[PDB]
Nucleic acid binder design. Structure first.
Lengths: 110, 39, 50, 56, 117
RNA sequence: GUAACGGGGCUAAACCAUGCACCGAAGCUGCGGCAGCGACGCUUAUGCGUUGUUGGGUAGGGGAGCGUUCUGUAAGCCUGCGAAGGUGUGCUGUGAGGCAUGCUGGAGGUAUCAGAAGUGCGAAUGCUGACAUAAGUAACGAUAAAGCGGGUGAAAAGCCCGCUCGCCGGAAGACCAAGGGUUCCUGUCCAACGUUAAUCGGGGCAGGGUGAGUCGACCCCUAAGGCGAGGCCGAAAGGCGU
RNA sequence: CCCGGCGAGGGGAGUGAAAAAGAACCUGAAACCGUGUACGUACAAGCAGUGGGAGCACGCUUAGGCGUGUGACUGCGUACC
RNA sequence: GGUUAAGCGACUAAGCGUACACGGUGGAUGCCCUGGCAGUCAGAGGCGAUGAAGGACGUGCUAAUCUGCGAUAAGCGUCGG
């Protein structure tokens, strides 16, 4: 059966995170944990935390045998954006967007 | 009682700040170079 | 409408459209184009045809 | 210089076709401790090619 | 007596976009472009309802001409001979016969050739 | 850049004369349907039948309609056997449109005939909100400069200790009056703010801290100037002055 | 109760008619951004449609073929105010 | 059966398009109302040197923002409900 874990309102843009999420789509859990460890990106920490949390759920709430779980589905989508102001030359002012994201991972024994 | 409240709070102030940043007198035109098809 | 008669910005120069009043009928919080007054709807009927 | 027409989502997708990054697959096992590491790099517990090293 | 315009406008917009399914890009997502696309499609369909009646006749003529020269006669002479023999067969029927029955077409050709004499 | 047959190519696929075929339009004919305007017959209104003829269209004139919110018909009718709204599907009117039903929704909605309009939007460098593109591009604010060891910590190039190196030194050092108003010190926290991270901070929260006969205001005295009992002027308001 | 930094954010359990009513909390449209499935696409020139039209996939079906999606190739075709 | 030729040719998707299913962002639409607008019928048409209108600083068990009150300070005396 399926098990879910989500990280809502994560402080990172959706486009940057989506690069990391492509590596681990459809792999085994052990390999996915190995790959994220040796990748040098800020997003790799968030995804690894979410994946480990998803692993913990599938064992304590649902059944067991973490040795044959796989990453079935993973996707990223945008969240609310905070707006701030940044001054420019000659009295002009500009808008700034600080984007966030929602992270979901689906792990199952199928 | 900080996070969401003040985080969203600043987005109200930015609107009025950008609203005021448009005094527009500093427009400084006259496009100082010679006229395009002058006399 | 409660407001002031000052022009919002000058005529030429800027890139915006021409405006001259904060209380124009085509602005948000502006005036109604043809506002209504209290009326009187009664008609007349002749005695004989009543 | 500015664009004259906004490019489509298709063209945005085509340009990003080279942005994908790559995995490692070059994971190696130490002779003595048996843990994983990169090639030509010290393990987490300070072992290199079986022989113990600084291991602070 | 104030009247709001939400429901009616939404319905009218949804009516048009449902007619633009399958069009490329923004021509199936935004109203201002889908409207013009639908109008163009209407004009083209009206125009093509006339042209459809010409292309098929052209094709029938070509097939009849090709089949007639197999039996040693040109198209124009064949058609003229049919008229001197008082034969009223539609060109659509003639092309169908040419494709699906060679012997009947040969009989027709021999009759027309005799009629020319 | 061939380019003074649309090309390919052509001694007829060129030009005169004659002839018969065929191709060719939304023109004409055939079949089916709609709408006017007349004529002729029945009902002699409507209701009909038999005919003839007409139907490109801007500015503009004339005639018919659809839909939306509100008032009467209304203590009527429909509503957990699921209302308005949202989202698909299927039928049918020449059109604006109408009807039935699956899923969401969880409380209101209106035959029919009349009445009144804030009655229909794509454009006005239209007004307000939301979201794109350029683009994960340009930039990260003086070219005075940093290296290493230890500590704390989930995490240390930027924090705390230590050593070495570099910069200013009529200042980038130590004070006062203006101006500001707790920014001062201690303990805790890192989600926002800090142009990156942060255990750090002029950031959040809680406590604490400013002692005068002699320093300064207040006080005594007047300059430029202000106000000004009476007073002199002036439609009113007021002006000038002992 | 579990993962996590004695975090933020989650997955269970429990209240409730309903938690896809969980405090950014009635309903929740459009632009805009994603994951999955079916078909097409790497020798091809233009307002991107329309008229023809193979092949493929799914559903019904008693043949016989219908319905939905896509659309190779080809005739015509220079947006709106 | 093999070996040579000549001719024809399924299967790829870095990415992209259309259709369908499921989501995110955003806040329209519907339904609400102690908030407004326009009036009929009555009342009153002034307050102040016995210190006004309008304010400053204070006042609670806890410290403040609203509401009251004035060193007798979320209140004191008397007559009725």
């Amino acid at each position: 059966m399926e098990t879910i874990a989500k990280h809502r309102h994560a402080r990172s843009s959706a486009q940057k995170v989506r690069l990391v999420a492509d590596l681990i789509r459809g792999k085994k859990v052990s390999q996915a944990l190995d790959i994220l460890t040796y990748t040098n990106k800020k997003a790799a920490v968030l995804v690894k935390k979410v994946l480990e949390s998803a692993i913990a759920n599938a064992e304590h709430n649902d059944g067991a045998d973490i040795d044959d779980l796989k990453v079935t589905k993973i996707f990223v989508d945008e969240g609310p954006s905070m707006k701030r102001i940044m001054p420019r030359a000659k009295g002009r002012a500009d808008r700034i967007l600080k984007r966030t994201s929602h992270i979901t991972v689906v792990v199952s024994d199928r | 009682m900080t996070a969401n409240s003040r985080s969203m709070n600043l987005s109200n102030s930015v609107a009025v700040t950008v609203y005021e940043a448009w005094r527009q007198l500093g427009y400084k035109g006259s496009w100082w170079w010679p006229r395009i098809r002058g006399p | 409408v409660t407001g002031s008669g000052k022009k919002p910005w000058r005529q030429k120069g800027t890139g915006r459209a021409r405006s001259g009043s904060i209380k124009s009928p085509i602005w948000r919080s502006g005036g109604v184009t043809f506002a209504a007054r209290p009326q009187d709807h009664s008609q007349k009927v002749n005695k004989k045809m009543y | 210089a500015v664009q004259q027409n906004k490019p489509t989502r298709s063209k945005r997708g085509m340009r990003r076709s080279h942005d994908a990054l790559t995995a490692v697959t070059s994971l190696s096992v130490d002779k003595t401790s048996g843990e994983k590491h990169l090639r030509h790099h010290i393990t987490a517990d300070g072992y290199y090619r079986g022989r113990k090293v600084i291991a602070k | 007596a104030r009247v709001k315009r939400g429901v009616i406008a939404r319905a009218r917009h949804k009516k048009i976009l449902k007619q633009a399914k399958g069009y490329y890009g923004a021509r199936s997502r935004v109203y201002r472009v889908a409207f013009q696309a639908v109008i163009k499609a209407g004009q083209y369909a009206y125009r093509d309802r006339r042209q459809r009646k010409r292309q098929f006749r052209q094709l029938w003529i070509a097939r009849i001409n090709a089949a007639a020269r197999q039996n040693g006669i040109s198209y124009s002479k064949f058609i003229n001979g049919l008229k001197k023999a008082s034969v009223e067969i539609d060109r659509k029927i003639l092309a169908d016969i040419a494709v699906f029955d060679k012997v009947a077409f040969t009989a027709l050709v021999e009759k027309a050739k005799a009629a020319l004499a």
